[PDB]
């Protein structure tokens, strides 16, 4: 890889600079290079990796949704035939999105997950695996769609099982995982009741554990709890 010649520490330094400059593609390339050094990532480093790729794929997803909407309107009754261009460009953006997802999943599989022994690292990586299979699922229309959905479900489920055993109900990683798995249920698995149940139970169990926290931990946990409440409000 093109980052092979750069020091791990320099790659991390530059990822931070890229974040400040809102250069998320660069940020992702630097973090990829860092991961490929083969050493485990710290908490802060894991965050840099996730931030970088979340922003890159987030932009791709937004673009894909715009194009998909235009494409769907083109195939409505009375719509004038404008040729293959809308499909082609949606496919281009889709292929790019899929490439990014495959890249992240690749890093997780080679070899971040297998070396992650602590609850916080293993849950975070499995959450990421769930997320990037969920993004693949959003654009999937073929033979492997069900298997993609199951790959997301399986990753989220393992993360859930570990998080329930090893982390307090207010742990931001546990909360973020639950938030996202709940969205998976609602948007991907056609299981809105599972989504609502998970969001509510997660919220209520966290509420009950807030008394144990410092002011700073309270702020962290309640921020994500509000997102759970936001989704519940949207869905009920």
């Amino acid at each position: 890889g093109a980052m092979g010649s750069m020091e791990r520490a320099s790659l991390i330094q530059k990822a931070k600079l890229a974040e400040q400059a809102e250069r998320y593609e660069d940020m992702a390339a630097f973090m990829k290079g860092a991961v490929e050094k083969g050493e485990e990532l710290s908490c802060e480093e894991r965050n840099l990796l996730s931030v970088a790729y979340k922003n890159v794929v987030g932009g791709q997803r937004a673009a894909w949704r715009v194009l998909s909407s235009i494409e769907q309107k083109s195939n409505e009754e009375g719509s004038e035939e404008k040729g293959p261009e809308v499909r082609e460009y949606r496919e281009k953006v889709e292929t790019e999105l899929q490439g990014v997802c495959d890249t992240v999943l690749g890093l997780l599989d080679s070899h971040l997950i297998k070396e992650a022994g602590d609850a916080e690292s293993r849950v975070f990586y499995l959450k990421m695996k769930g997320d990037y299979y969920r993004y693949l699922a959003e654009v999937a229309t073929g033979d492997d769609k069900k298997r993609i959905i199951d790959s997301a479900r399986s990753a989220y489920q393992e993360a859930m099982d570990i998080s329930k055993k090893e982390m307090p109900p207010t742990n931001p990683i546990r909360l973020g995982l639950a938030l996202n798995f709940s969205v998976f249920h609602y948007e991907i698995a056609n299981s809105p009741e599972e989504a609502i149940s998970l969001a509510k139970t997660t919220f209520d169990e966290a509420m009950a554990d807030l008394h144990t926290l410092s002011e700073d931990s309270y702020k962290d946990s309640t921020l994500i709890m509000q997102l759970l409440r936001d989704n519940l409000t949207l869905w009920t």
Partner: peptide
């Protein structure tokens, strides 16, 4: 769209 982190 719903919130994710």
């Amino acid at each position: 769209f719903p919130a994710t982190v």
